Swiss-Prot record, chains A, B:
PROSITE patterns given in the database record: CARBOXYLESTERASE_B_1, CARBOXYLESTERASE_B_2
Species, as recorded: Mus musculus
Alphabetical list of InterPro entries matching this protein: AB_hydrolase_fold, AChE-related_enzymes, AChE_tetra, CarbesteraseB, Carboxylesterase_B_AS, Carboxylesterase_B_CS, Cholinesterase
Protein name listed in UniProt: Acetylcholinesterase
Cell compartment(s), UniProt: Synapse; Secreted; Cell membrane
Gene responsible for this protein: Ache
Amino acid sequence: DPQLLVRVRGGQLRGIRLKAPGGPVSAFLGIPFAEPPVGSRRFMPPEPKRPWSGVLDATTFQNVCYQYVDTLYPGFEGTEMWNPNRELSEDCLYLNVWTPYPRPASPTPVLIWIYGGGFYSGAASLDVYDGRFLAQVEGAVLVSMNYRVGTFGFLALPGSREAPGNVGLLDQRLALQWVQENIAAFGGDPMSVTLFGESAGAASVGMHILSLPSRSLFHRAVLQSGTPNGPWATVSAGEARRRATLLARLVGCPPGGAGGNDTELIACLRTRPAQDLVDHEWHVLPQESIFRFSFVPVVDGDFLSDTPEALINTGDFQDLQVLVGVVKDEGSYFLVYGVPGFSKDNESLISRAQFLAGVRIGVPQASDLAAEAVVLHYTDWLHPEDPTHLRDAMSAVVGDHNVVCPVAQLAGRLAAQGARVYAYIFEHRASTLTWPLWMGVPHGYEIEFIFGLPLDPSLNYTTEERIFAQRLMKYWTNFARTGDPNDPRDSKSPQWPPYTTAAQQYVSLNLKPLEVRRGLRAQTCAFWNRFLPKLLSAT
Amino acid sequence: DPQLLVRVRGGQLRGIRLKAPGGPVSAFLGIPFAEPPVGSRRFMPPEPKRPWSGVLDATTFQNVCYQYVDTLYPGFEGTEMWNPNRELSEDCLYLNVWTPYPRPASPTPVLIWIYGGGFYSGAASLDVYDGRFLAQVEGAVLVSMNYRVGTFGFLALPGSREAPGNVGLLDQRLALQWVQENIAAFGGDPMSVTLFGESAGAASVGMHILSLPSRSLFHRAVLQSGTPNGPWATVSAGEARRRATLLARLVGCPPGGAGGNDTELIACLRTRPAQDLVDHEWHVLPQESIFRFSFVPVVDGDFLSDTPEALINTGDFQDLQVLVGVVKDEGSYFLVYGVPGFSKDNESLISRAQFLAGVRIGVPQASDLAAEAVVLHYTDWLHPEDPTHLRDAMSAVVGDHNVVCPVAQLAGRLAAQGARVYAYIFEHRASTLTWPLWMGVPHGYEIEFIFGLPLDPSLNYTTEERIFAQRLMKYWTNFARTGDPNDPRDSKSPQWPPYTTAAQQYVSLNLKPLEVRRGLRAQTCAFWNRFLPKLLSAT
């Protein structure tokens, strides 16, 4: 079947024909995009996959990059669903392609997805990132690649030749240059590349916009629940180094009282079993905390010329179309992972003292005064001990601090600089959600919908959820083709207005039709984005 | 007429028969309560008036104590109404008495009023403090004394024998001891003394509660728009001294490069024409500001054993009944007196920069960071330049900082310590009000109502206002007799609940019936009463 047989710039491939509810889909899973970054390649910028003979099989999902695996709640769908579903391996630089069966007629727009998992975990192989529905139904050419997370992706000794950092991003950039020079053959338009990701994938998409060289490889961008500018998606060189060598040292690299040879250091590191590194991953953070990750993009003054803050602050984004948004309760999920009093198993009605402590875990960089400021802001002084309030407060400190305000800081900075921005607030809690009611709509629970999982009848969502999904898919693909999530020409009732400095408009993405709103946590985010920082830089 | 002829502990007096709308009233105006504090008596604690021969005439209002006179808007009722309406003079220690004609049957409860004017101005002689209606109508024995304001009342050189401070308060205490030993003869009950005052009079009432010796002279207390604990009603010894000597020095006391003799200093000061002092009154403040006064009660460690803060913080007020409240816009009035952009003549739609400056005048003690905090808190980040918002914001910074939050800090501290507290928010703007609409209900515009001025038909308020007034008078006299502003036994519809730490209940005093509410500016006041201070004590 020529539908499943495609010649790529480096060789032939055989896809597989998948069956989505509305029909058939072509799927080319496992395409090498680079030479496995193993052995003396570990910590190195990726290299273009060499051309192969014969027909490369591409009927299946490849190995997940090497990464920590979540224990915490073993056998629990809520956590497991995020875990690797393929074998772990340093040989994981592959991407996927879904195209409607049969290949489109003309150059369809492409949706390149970037998975997220703190920069330390994640995989395109995942169920919720099943690009079949968006290709099947909205007739889109969808691509999802794997990029090195953890030490392998980001361990860096800034200035070094052999562990220079951000290589997990270069992985994604490489997948992008490949989509450029080969998506054509799948019926995709190399001229309408729309990047889109969640958590650190969103953060990533952000970095592509902030990085010159990534510019020519995409035209539109979506950033769900995450940005390049907050407190957790980048570290300085100094800290990077501090956590590289510290990690090295815990692994015996270098052995003895040796030193001053970054090369020997990396050479040594390059011999340790992958799992040895993952074993010490979490011991290099400088404080007890949540929503803070050990190995993530570093401000090298290369891939990022300066901090994302400085960049979105003075960049020229005068033409960029960008969709951005957030969910009802970003912070909830993270509380279970480390804030005394919280669990998925009870209502986590915490004490005040617990909440006071939470604030220091959740805002680890905060001095005392700054912590005080945060407590002032989230305490309800008519009921400073209501456990239910405290509980939700904790979730807000975390969610606002890491996701919401940073989103809003980016939305506004973008708009003010030229961007056409759109914003939203996912508020629908999936019926199927396995987390406790108290977490409401946790970080990452919009994905099932954007991808169109409710369209699968076996999965069993509600018809509303299904319709909902379709609506959501429609907005994305529409922003994808046009650069406006809006019903074509067809001005079908509710409209989605561009987020603007002055009006500050965003929409409620939920079961009830679009419902425009103004100001994304405006006060709260003024707290965080405007004042808090000066407090911190004083203390 | 024996009604108008009364023998007091020191001599005979002849009252005059006044005519209130509902009938006749006995009025004993001008009763010396102390020996004129003139000459070598200036700056000295007051002394009990010597007994006189014959029949002391008491048919008229005596001289207003020596004080600055407001220019600003000459001929304008809004300011003039506060100005002296009698001759100025250091010989002003007299009080007044209104009793219903004819003398009550049995010991009526007494309402002793304490006028307020920044501790620098004021007089019982004023029109709005006409105790005839409250005696006429609610059959109450009302008393209003004059106490030395300004330098004469408060200039102090702490530790000195001859200018020890707080003598204006001792004046009021003396009037109190007189009411004690003589109100009896006017049909008043020396056993049901209810102090009640506004602005610094309220602040004063507060100090009586905080001062042991004032305790035995009153049983209930009301504090309108003012408390002993805020930022402006007390100064330390050190500052007191600093402003005494500085004032002295500007007046040539002592002349030359002399010194180290507080006595010579005061002796010298004691020779300067009263107006010479008033002339330099306003030059000893340490910063440009508003709602800040030069000469006011000092924390001597005598009349006040420690700061009012410390006192309401650890005092035992377990039995005290106290009514407390505030008006819609405390801060408005003060803006005209010194905040660039404001005037009574235009809508004062200020610029942002103006508002930024306002904040430093209005919160003179604030460091930069603290000012920042205040700006953060009152700026509306969706419209940080809306002049109308800025305008009202300025008024709130001032009103919350000086009156509201301090009231709330006291209410709560009292309640928590045993007090039975009641609270309110006067929200009715008199129809007659001559200030611009933008000031809404300015500091001091409840007085007309509590005193019952609308009952006078010539004055021409609205019937509602009249009825309103009657209602208000009823609450006061009721709190006065019972210690509960509530309709007797007669549970006549809406009830006024005690302000409590937990529920934080207060009521809307306005045209529409009582309407209980919870939390007096709860967030805002948490800002000011809890956080702001630590910010300031850090900076």
